[PDB]
């Protein structure tokens, strides 16, 4: 039978594949590049656009936009290119023949769902579509029906408590501190060591540093005093051109911003204290279960030691008797895709799809009404 597509519009990556697969058939940065310099060689090739791995390969020549910022799609004209490239080039599939499943952060502007639908039915003519809360899919991904899911992307962090398959919407918290703001802070502090990263292509050079060499302090003040006391922390890295750059305590100072957004100059508290203040909003009956089923999700939670730092910290807020457990499967970056793959292949779900017929009768308001 025709299988549904499963597609996740992260800020940093697009993940796509066929429902029932255990991994995405395409991942690539959701990045759109345009050439800026003059084209010298007549008879060379010419393109108004590159997408994904193309815009990565040539990035020295390009300005790189992300069409998504803090999980809001900030211009549609590029996004439609990213979807077009995903279906036609990466999956090599006609969208006319497959249901599609699309994925979204919990609070983001309600107009986003309307436009995101209108492009699926008008542009790609998809038979059937659905839009699913990232934290919900993380539960399907991690084999659970009760938990509190902390999920942090390239563009958004959020908590969503779920009990017995009921979501609990009063208890839902959203800090937009994410991968990109860890990058921009990493650039600002790297300036202290006498390096500057100035451009879009160069910012991804920063990001590769962040991914390779950042880690989370199990005590911040201990390691901060340690690096001043001796350089054993210090590690060094090769830029694309072969220049070495060398980084000390400063590589942990970015992961610590998730636990002290005072560094970035946010009002709100670290994601431990949001996680706790979310659980406190929940009914006192359930909380013993939410304390055990803490689930990490999304790539910004891949930093080594974030699990233990979370456990050691929230085990200080929570009352001493409660069992606190933190559950960090090593695939968690994928897990929102995996759980969407599982959800899209359930038979009970097949009644849930928004049909092309019903959209055509009802108009895009249908997406709020039916979908949740």
């Amino acid at each position: 039978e025709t299988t549904a597509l499963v597609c996740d519009n992260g800020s940093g990556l697009v993940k796509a594949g066929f429902a029932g697969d255990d991994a995405p058939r395409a991942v690539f940065p959701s990045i759109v590049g345009r050439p800026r310099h003059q084209g010298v060689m007549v008879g060379m090739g010419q393109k108004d656009s590159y997408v994904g791995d193309e815009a990565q390969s040539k990035r020295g020549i390009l300005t790189l936009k992300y069409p998504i910022e803090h999980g809001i799609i900030t211009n549609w004209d590029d996004m439609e290119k990213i979807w077009h490239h995903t279906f036609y080039n990466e999956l090599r599939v006609a969208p006319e023949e497959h249901p599609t499943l699309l994925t979204e952060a919990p609070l983001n502007p309600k107009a986003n769902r309307e436009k995101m639908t209108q492009i699926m039915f008008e542009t790609f003519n998809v038979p059937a579509m659905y839009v699913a809360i990232q934290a919900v899919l993380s539960l399907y991904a991690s084999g659970r029906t009760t938990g509190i899911v902390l999920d942090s992307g390239d563009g958004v962090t959020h908590n969503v408590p779920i009990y017995e398959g009921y979501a609990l919407p009063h208890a839902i918290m959203r800090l937009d501190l994410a991968g990109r703001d860890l990058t921009d802070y990493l650039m600002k502090i790297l300036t202290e060591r006498g390096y500057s990263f100035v451009t879009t292509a160069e910012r991804e050079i920063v990001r590769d540093i962040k991914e390779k060499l950042c880690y989370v302090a199990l005590d911040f003040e201990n390691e901060m005093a340690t690096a001043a006391s001796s350089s054993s922390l210090e590690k060094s890295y090769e830029l694309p051109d072969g220049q070495v750059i060398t980084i000390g305590n400063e590589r942990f100072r970015c992961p610590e911003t998730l636990f002290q957004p005072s560094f970035i100059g946010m009002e709100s508290a670290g994601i431990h204290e949001t996680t706790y203040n979310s659980i406190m909003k929940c009914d006192i009956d359930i909380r013993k279960d939410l304390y055990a089923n803490n689930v990490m999700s999304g790539g910004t939670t891949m930093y080594p030691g974030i699990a233990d730092r979370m456990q050691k910290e929230i085990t200080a807020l929570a009352p001493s008797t409660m069992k606190i457990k933190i559950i960090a499967p090593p695939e968690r970056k994928y897990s929102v895709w995996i759980g969407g793959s599982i959800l899209a292949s359930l038979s009970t779900f097949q009644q849930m799809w928004i049909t092309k017929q019903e959209y055509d009768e009802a108009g895009p308001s249908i997406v709020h009404r039916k979908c949740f």
């Binding site: 910022e69 803090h70 999980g71 809001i72 900030t74 502007p109 937009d176």
Partner: peptide, 7 residues
């Protein structure tokens, strides 16, 4: 966004 943030 439209207000409290750049998107």
């Amino acid at each position: 966004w439209x207000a409290x943030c750049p998107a």
